[model samples]
Target: EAEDLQVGQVELGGGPGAGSLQPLALEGSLQ
Candidate 1:
């Protein structure tokens, strides 16, 4: 299924607080 194979990510942020490499819905980094 095309919809079932969503293997990717999206840039939901920008600037200094961006590039956190965290999930879109997740809160805080995975440190």
Candidate 2:
């Protein structure tokens, strides 16, 4: 039941901006 299992994740933070923990998608450390 791998697929049956509910896959989820909690967003640590928002994307790049004034202050955001989460890095920009497809661009690591460059954002």
Candidate 3:
């Protein structure tokens, strides 16, 4: 349901090198 639900972290791409966070994708924060 709701794609298994993972509404926790979300800030991917833009600023801080390219954004940063998880819940699906990371590797930002100066990426």
On TM-score, the candidate that comes out on top is 1
Where does candidate 2 have its weakest 10-residue lDDT segment? 3-12
- Report the lDDT tens digits of candidate 2 across residue range 1-28: 5323422123223344423342434333
lDDT of each: 0.39, 0.34, 0.35
Model 3 lDDT on a 0 to 1 scale: 0.35
Error of 2 at 18 (Å): 28
- The candidates, ranked best first by TM-score, are 1, 2, 3
lDDT of 3 at 7: 32
Error of 3 at 10 (Å): 6.9
Expressed as tens digits, the lDDT of each residue in 1-31 for candidate 3 is: 6323433224423443333333223433323
Instruction: Tell me which of candidates 2 and 3 scores higher on TM-score.
Output: 2
Residue 8 Cα positional deviation in candidate 2, in Å, after optimal superposition? 7.5
| Superior candidate under lDDT, 1 versus 2 | 1
